[PDB]
Structure 1
Amino acid sequence: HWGYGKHNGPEHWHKDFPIAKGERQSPVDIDTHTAKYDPSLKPLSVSYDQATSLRILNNGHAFNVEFDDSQDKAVLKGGPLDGTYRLIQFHFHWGSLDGQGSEHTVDKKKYAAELHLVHWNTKYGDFGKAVQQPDGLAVLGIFLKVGSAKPGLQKVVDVLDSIKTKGKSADFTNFDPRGLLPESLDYWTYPGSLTTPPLLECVTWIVLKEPISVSSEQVLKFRKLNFNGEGEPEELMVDNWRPAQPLKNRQIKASFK
C-alpha cells in the first residue's frame, strides 16, 4: 500500500494512481514574485463559530480532527470560491526535523508543518461526490513555523497519546478551529489536488501567507505518533508530506499586493 517510505513513497504513487502525473497536482512551490495579484478576489469568509468537532482519528498517514458536516455549521466562502463549502476535517503534514514538513513551499522555503482545513462544496451533497468534481473541495492551507507555542493547538497535542497507532480514534468534542488561524487571511490560490492518494484533482487551494507559530514541544509530540498499527513494528509518523509538483499550465493568484 502507498505510504511515505523508500519503497512506497511519493515517487511510487503514480503506479497505483496515474493522476499523480496529471495537469493540476499539488502541492506546488509558490513563487511569490510571479504570483499575480488579483484585485477582484474577494475577502475570504471563515465562519467557524458553530463548528462541532466529533473525534480524532489516526488513519495511518496523519491524524484527522473530524467535524459534523451534516449542517452548515463551519463554512468557508468568498475568496476565489463560488458557493459554500463545509468543514469536514483538518489534519497536518509534518517533518522529522524543523527544516522540512510542509507540502507547499514559498520561494522554495519549507516550513516545519502544514495544516489543511478540508471543506466540500455543498452543491454536491457529500464529500464523496465532491471529490469527483473539479470544484469539489476548498482546502485552507496554513504553514507552521517553530517558535512560540500556539495555545489553541494544545488540546490537539494532548490527545495524541490516545491515538498513537493506526486505526485508533478518540472522542474530541468542542474543539474550536478558530484557535489555529493566523491574524491575516491574505492568501494565494490555485487549482490543484489532494496531496495524498487518490490525488484527485478536485481542490481549490487557498494557502495563507502568514504562518502560525507552534512550539518545539508541540511539533515534537506530532513526531511521536506511529504510522503502524498497535502490535506492528514501530515506525514514527514523520515526513508525511509530498514534495512540490510541476505547476504546468497554472497561475497562482494573490489576494494581496
Structure 2
Amino acid sequence: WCYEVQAESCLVPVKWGGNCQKDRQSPINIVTTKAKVDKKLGRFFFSGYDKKQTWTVQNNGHSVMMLLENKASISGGGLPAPYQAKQLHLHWSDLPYKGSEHSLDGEHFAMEMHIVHEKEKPEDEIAVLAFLVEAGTQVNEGFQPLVEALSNIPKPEMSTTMAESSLLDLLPKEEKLRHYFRYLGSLTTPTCDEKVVWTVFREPIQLHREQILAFSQKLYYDKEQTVSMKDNVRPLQQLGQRTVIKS
C-alpha cells in the first residue's frame, strides 16, 4: 500500500484493501456549526504526559513514529474507560493549506499529529487523539528534540533516540484542549479497521514553518531516497450515517 504521491514515481488509497472501502472510514471534514454540543463530553485527564523521557523515534516508511510503550495514558474526554498510549506519529505536507488528515469547515492544516491509544483490558477499542498543526513565527522549542532527531532517521527501518522531552512539550497548553470534536471512525492506513473513537482538538499546535518543512526536507519514503516523505495523507472519506459532536 502507498500514498497517491508515492505512485507518482503500489496500492494507492482509492485502491486500498482490507476494510478501507467500508462505510465508517476516516478522516473526514468537520462542519463545525453542524457538530452539536454534547454535555457528556468533559475535559481529558492526561497521565504520564508531563514526564521527561528519552523517546525512540523511527521512520517506518509511512511516517515518523515514537514508541510510547504504555508510559502515558488518558481518561475523561467522554471516554468509557482509560486508554494506554502506544505510539505518536504525524501526517504532513509542505504547504500551509495541505497536510492534515481531517479538515475543519473545509480548511486543512500543515500537519496532523495522532497519538494512538488502546482500551485498557468493537467500535472504540482504539482512541486516537488528533492535533492540527499550523505555522507560527516562533520556533516551538518543545518540538525541537523531535525535529532534531529527524536527520538521524532519513530512510525507512531507521531509528534514533531523542533528547529528553515530554508529550506535553509537543502539545498546546492543557487549558486550551477543552474544546474538541468527537466521532466514530477508522484507522487512516490499511487495514483501516473501523475501531477508533476519534478526537480532534480545535486548538492547533504552532510550529515554525521551517520546523514543519524539516519533515519533508529530511525524510524519505524509500531506502534509495528518491521520494521525499510528504503528503502521507489519506483522502477525505464521507461522514455517511454518522454524526459529529463537540464538547
The alignment's TM-score, normalised by the length of structure 2, stands at: 0.91
SS of the equivalent of 1:92 reads strand
Q: Which residue of 2 aligns with 1:222?
A: 215
**CA distance 1:50–1:147, shift in 2 (3 Å):** closer
Q: Which residue of 2 aligns with 1:205?
A: 198
- For the pair 1:143 / 2:143, whether they are aligned, the reply is no
Offset, 1:51: 6.8
Q: What does 1:106-255 align with in structure 2 at a 5 Å threshold?
A: 106-123=104-121, 133-148=122-137, 149-172=139-162, 174-183=164-173, 184-185=176-177, 186-224=179-217, 225-229=219-223, 232-255=224-247
SS of the equivalent of 2:100 reads coil
Do the aligned residues in 2 keep the contact of 1:53 with 1:65 (CA within 8 Å)?
no
Task: Measure the CA separation in 2 of the matches of 1:23 and 1:53.
Answer: 40
**Cα deviations by residue, 1:114-165 (Å, 9 ceiling, x for unpaired):** 0111111111xxxxxxxxx421111110000012332111110001010000
Stretches of structure 1 lacking an aligned partner (at least 5 in a row): 124-132
SS of the equivalent of 2:151 reads helix
Do the aligned residues in 2 keep the contact of 1:139 with 1:203 (CA within 8 Å)?
yes
Task: Measure the CA separation in 2 of the matches of 1:43 and 1:216.
Answer: 30
SS of the equivalent of 1:179 reads helix
The number of equivalent residue pairs is 238
**Cα deviations by residue, 1:166-200 (Å, 9 ceiling, x for unpaired):** 11011236431101221311100001111111111
Which deviates the most, 217-226 or 168-177? 168-177
Question: One-letter code of the match for 1:237?
Answer: M
Q: Which residue of 2 aligns with 1:3?
A: 3
Q: Find the partner of 2:79 among 61, 78, 81.
A: 81
The alignment's TM-score, normalised by the length of structure 1, stands at: 0.88
Task: Measure the CA separation in 2 of the matches of 1:75 and 1:173.
Answer: 21
Offset, 1:97: 1.9
Offset, 1:9: 2.3
Q: What does 1:7-86 align with in structure 2 at a 5 Å threshold?
A: 8-13=11-16, 16-17=17-18, 19-47=19-47, 48-50=49-51, 52=53, 54-69=55-70, 73-86=71-84
Structure 1 residue ranges (4+ consecutive) displaced by more than 6 angstroms after TM superposition = none
Identity, in percent, stands at 36
Do the aligned residues in 1 keep the contact of 2:3 with 2:233 (CA within 8 Å)?
no
Task: Measure the CA separation in 2 of the matches of 1:197 and 1:139.
Answer: 16
Which deviates the most, 55-64 or 3-12? 3-12
**CA distance 1:51–1:45, shift in 2 (3 Å):** farther
Task: Measure the CA separation in 2 of the matches of 1:78 and 1:136.
Answer: 15
**CA distance 1:68–1:233, shift in 2 (3 Å):** closer
Which deviates the most, 135-144 or 175-184? 175-184
Aligned-CA RMSD value: 1.6
Do the aligned residues in 2 keep the contact of 1:55 with 1:173 (CA within 8 Å)?
no
Question: One-letter code of the match for 1:9?
Answer: V
**CA distance 1:53–1:169, shift in 2 (3 Å):** same
Question: One-letter code of the match for 1:211?
Answer: P
